[PDB]
Amino acid sequence: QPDVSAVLSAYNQQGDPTMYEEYYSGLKHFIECSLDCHRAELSQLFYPLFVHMYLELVYNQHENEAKSFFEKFHGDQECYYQDDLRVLSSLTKKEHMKGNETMLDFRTSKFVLRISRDSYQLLKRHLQEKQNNQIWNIVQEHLYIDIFD
Ligand SMILES: [Ca+2]
């Protein structure tokens, strides 16, 4: 397991923080409008992407944006993540993350994700529609994700 500082290194490369809600809303609509088979697989992305993006906003001192992002998307996460989310919501400032062992519980790389190539194809295409979609960067650099036939 990585140390705290290694975990926090994951939240360095921020995107345009004013667009995070747009990116996540875009993904949500894309996933919800997919065929059942693709939607079932891709729905796995929701929680880890939400946690990473929120912490990215907080870590880069976009406190307003983080609060707003959390308020908009925490509600539709799986019911069994809502206890983890209450704890996540107490982390509102960069100060709260630094030197904090609880960050181990939210490390993006602990969420194992497996999807079909078909689903990946389609996801990749959606995420390349908008220029420098930050979710595409998180998928490339931080998600523990494998694709299969
Ligand atoms: Ca839980």
Features:
mainly alpha; binds calcium ion; Transcription initiation factor TFIID subunit 5; two-stranded parallel sheet; 149 residues; 9 helices; 54% helix
Element-by-element helix/strand order: HHHHHHHEHHE
Please tally the helical runs, counting DSSP H or I stretches of 4 or more residues. Answer: 9
Structural class given helices, strands, pairing?
Answer: mainly alpha
> In CATH terms, what is the fold-level topology?
Serine Threonine Protein Phosphatase 5, Tetratricopeptide repeat
Q: Enumerate the strands of the largest sheet in spatial order, edge to edge or round the barrel.
A: 1-2
The CATH architecture can be named as: Alpha Horseshoe
Computed CA radius of gyration, to the nearest angstrom: 15 Å
Description:
The protein is mostly helical and 149 residues long. Helices cover 54% and strands 7% of the residues. It has one domain (1-149): TFIID subunit TAF5, NTD2 domain (Serine Threonine Protein Phosphatase 5, Tetratricopeptide repeat, Alpha Horseshoe). The protein has helices at residues 4-8, 20-32, 36-42, 46-59, 63-73, 82-89, 94-97, 117-127, 134-141; strands at residues 112-116, 144-148. The chain has a two-stranded parallel sheet with strand order 1-2. Helix 3 packs across helix 8 (117-127) and helix 4 (46-59) packs antiparallel against helix 5. Bound molecules: calcium ion (CA). Calcium ion binds at residues 80-81, 83-84. It is classed as transcription. Keywords: Transcription factor, TFIID subunit, TAF5, transcription.
